[PDB]
Design a protein around this ligand. Structure first.
Ligand SMILES: Nc1nc2c(ncn2[C@H]2C[C@H](O)[C@@H](COP(=O)(O)OP(=O)(O)OP(=O)(O)O)O2)c(=O)[nH]1
Ligand SMILES: Nc1nc2c(ncn2[C@H]2C[C@H](O)[C@@H](COP(=O)(O)OP(=O)(O)OP(=O)(O)O)O2)c(=O)[nH]1
Ligand SMILES: Nc1ncnc2c1ncn2[C@H]1C[C@H](O)[C@@H](COP(=O)(O)OP(=O)(O)OP(=O)(O)O)O1
Ligand SMILES: Nc1ncnc2c1ncn2[C@H]1C[C@H](O)[C@@H](COP(=O)(O)OP(=O)(O)OP(=O)(O)O)O1
Ligand SMILES: [Mg+2]
Ligand SMILES: [Mg+2]
Ligand SMILES: [Mg+2]
Ligand SMILES: [Mg+2]
Lengths: 434, 434
């Protein structure tokens, strides 16, 4: 039920924090927002790849993408919360909740939803995985549990993001110490790395936490009241209802903005821009304003602003139509896939894949990223092995100012993923002496 | 005794050169000085690392360090020689020696005391060793004698310096053909590479000659009358008395100048400069002059000039107090370790280690040096193996305008150590085509 889903608990708490005992100027979710804003992991997003590597231009990075997702998520959360308190009046009438709380939760979750991504993006994650699969790290296969090896060979940015958010350090336990509602709404694949893709459900495409933090998530999963889907030997719970909204906001934003940026770069003609969006923007377009503009940028910006407004309302309608199934855990798709504009979205995505992801420029950067990440990971792993050599001591002093082998390897992968693109490239040249 | 220690013999001589038959304008030790000054190995010291690699700035290189050590050694030798001829009048009264001869010997020995060091310094030597230990060169372990392999895996700059000084070439035997007193005073570890650190004595921390020149040193060791410390299967003699003075001069100079340069660079505050040297400079400091100066450079230069003058006199006193033990071979430490200022010296050294050697700047350069040296050594060794390939012929023509395997490997290591830092880096890029 909804009372346990909006928990204000933080790690290490003993008492019970109640909504009616909060300070209304600064609620806990706003504190979460402010704690994410002021941290270094959030700042490192400014020079991390969204689509085009090493482009910190007029193209998007992870930071600006996260900000746009935050705005869209705040809007979605406010509408859905107003409709929910309309449906269940006891929430507001007894517990003391307002529709701004839902917006704060979704905004905070959407702000930190990519905070664990490594440099170079998808190619970076695949390179980290291939290093342990077919490279040097393969030699560790026999020393590790099967699920730990699966963690290392299918490295996921979501698990690393959870690790960053809930990291324990000497003298400061809990990390950022976010609320449990925010951690639940941030969590989109509540399962371990094995088994690999059991079903066709949407919460099974990947995994969301490592083996070193499973216990932590267990605590979270038992406070919110999430339904359990497996207890044999591998735990898996159902989604928090607001993770659907977070995912919808992320999908809308990147789907539209990638097209707009590709048009502005010179890779997609504007005829496609009008053709694939006339249906989306037809219900609110004022042709006069469209015909007055004299630049491609103004036209594409107008079209994007209209399309986002249409899609947000459609998503809210879908969520309120399937609320019961979502709360019961039986809803196996995304809110976007149940929309009237699926064909247009698929056409835009296919055009983006053909014209942007496979561009020469984009390709060369990913190959360079593969080389850089492999070099840095091999250096760290060889330093971890010997430990007695002078060279090993130098590498330790440069790249790292009692734990198990799995903990050491996962820490190595986490430290590689903190770097930006430029810092990784600079370290690569310094290692090579170039 | 002292008559045989000041020998004027050169390699290949048949007759006996006597001191009273010399030309007083140009004695043999001055000829040694002039022969070292005009050679190419001495010139290559201008772009070789002392502390900070690739800094040929206002920081020291090996050449300027060697010049300062030469000045301090000349002073020490003159004082000790005057006191010795005071103690033993028969030297001057019969053989015809003057106290300038001791200064000439110590100056010539201190001028060439680092002439065998490779590029990048201590990290360079360790890289050359690690190449044979854990790298490609390990494959030769089974083809070599144990002492030869120990030579190759504990590569020493002192042995390479002896090799440079006493190198035989077609048409010119003996190399620079220095006097035997100078060669003895240059020699600080008269032993082979095995056994490794037998005792806690000071002449056992390392080794001083390779297996290809052992015979040569034997000749020297039998002309001076050095005492023998082992004859089972590994030869080891005692130190020439003036090697103590050479080592004292080297220690004083680098200990003070490293601190001064670190202060001038911006890595050590000046408060430490006054705190750790007030005791050293207290007996001769004129506060008026110190308070008149208005720059950090002038103050640190004043303090250094006072400290060197104090330490020189203390070292002379220690040498004359323990002369009998030194001549008997029973003196197991250095003249610096028997001084009243050991605590201040240790504090300055520890500060230098924490603040200069482990700086980021310093660290990155050493890692690059490791990469460069490993690449060049592997290329030379692979050229030495196959010999029939076209690529091998090209590498031979580029890097080298009937001998055993050990001779070939030691010649490879000697040719790598002739390069400066810049030349090694340029060759590395040319090999990589960058
Ligand atoms: N350059 C390049 N970019 C790609 C590729 N695949 C995806 N992208 C970029 C374009 C999208 O704007 C961006 C979205 O990345 P996400 O990790 O957020 O993807 P997704 O929504 O599938 O999220 P997920 O990790 O599955 O929850 O990734 C690719 O193969 N190459
Ligand atoms: N960058 C760097 N410099 C070092 C390190 N260790 C020593 N040095 C530098 C600082 C000293 O001024 C300089 C002295 O080198 P030497 O080879 O003359 O040393 P030492 O007096 O121990 O002579 P030795 O070869 O044992 O007779 O070496 C190190 O780990 N890193
Ligand atoms: N409903 C919404 N909620 C949140 N963000 C939105 C919404 N609609 C659009 N956005 C995003 C994308 C737009 O470029 C940007 C500004 O929105 P907005 O000013 O309402 O758009 P617009 O230019 O279509 O205005 P209008 O509807 O007044 O003509 O915010
Ligand atoms: N006794 C010495 N013998 C040889 N070199 C020395 C001696 N003392 C110092 N040095 C070195 C380091 C000094 O910076 C440099 C010049 O010495 P010097 O001019 O005597 O020093 P100073 O500035 O202390 O002079 P003074 O004693 O006249 O005040 O030579
Ligand atoms: Mg995102
Ligand atoms: Mg609008
Ligand atoms: Mg020296
Ligand atoms: Mg003086």
């Amino acid at each position: 039920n909804w009372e346990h889903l909006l928990s204000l608990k933080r790690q290490g708490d003993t008492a019970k924090r109640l909504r009616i005992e909060q300070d209304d100027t600064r609620l806990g979710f706003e504190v979460d927002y402010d704690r994410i804003i002021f941290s270094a992991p959030f700042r490192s997003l400014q020079d991390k790849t969204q689509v085009i590597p090493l482009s910190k231009d007029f193209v998007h990075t992870r930071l600006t993408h996260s900000l746009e997702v935050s705005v869209v998520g705040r809007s979605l959360g406010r509408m859905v919360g107003k409709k929910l308190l309309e449906k269940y009046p006891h929430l507001e009438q007894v517990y003391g909740y307002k529709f701004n709380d839902f917006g704060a939760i979704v905004a905070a979750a959407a702000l930190a939803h990519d905070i664990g991504n490594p440099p170079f993006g998808a190619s970076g994650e695949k390179a980290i995985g291939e290093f342990f699969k077919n490279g040097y790290g393969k030699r560790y296969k026999d020393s590790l549990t099967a699920k730990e090896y699966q963690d290392l060979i299918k490295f996921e940015g979501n698990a690393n993001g959870f690790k960053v958010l809930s990291q324990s350090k000497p003298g400061a336990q809990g990390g950022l110490r976010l609320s449990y509602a925010t951690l639940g709404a941030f969590m989109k694949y509540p399962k371990e790395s094995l088994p690999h893709k059991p079903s066709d459900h949407i919460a099974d495409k990947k995994y969301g936490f490592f083996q070193s933090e499973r216990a932590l998530f267990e605590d979270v999963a038992q406070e919110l009241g999430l339904l359990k889907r497996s207890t044999t030997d591998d735990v898996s719970w159902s989604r928090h209802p607001l993770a659907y909204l977070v995912e919808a906001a992320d999908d809308i934003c990147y789907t539209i903005i990638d097209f707009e940026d590709g048009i502005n770069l010179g890779l997609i003609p504007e005829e496609y821009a009008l053709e694939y969006m006339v249906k989306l923007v037809g219900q609110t377009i004022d042709r006069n304003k469209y015909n007055a503009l004299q630049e491609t940028s103004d036209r594409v910006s107008y079209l994007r602003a209209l399309a986002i407004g249409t899609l947000i309302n459609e998503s809210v309608d879908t969520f309120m139509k399937y609320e019961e199934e979502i709360l019961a855990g039986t809803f196996d798709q995304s809110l976007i896939d149940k929309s009237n504009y699926q064909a247009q979205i698929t056409d835009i995505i296919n055009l983006s894949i053909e014209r942007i992801y496979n561009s020469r420029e984009v390709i060369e950067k990913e190959i360079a990223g593969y080389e850089i990440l492999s070099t840095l990971l091999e250096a760290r792993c060889r330093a971890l092995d010997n430990n007695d050599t002078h060279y090993n001591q130098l590498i330790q002093q440069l790249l790292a100012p009692e734990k198990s082998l799995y903990e050491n390897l996962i820490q190595i992968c986490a430290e590689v993923s903190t770097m930006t693109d430029g810092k990784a490239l600079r370290n690569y040249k310094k290692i090579k002496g170039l």
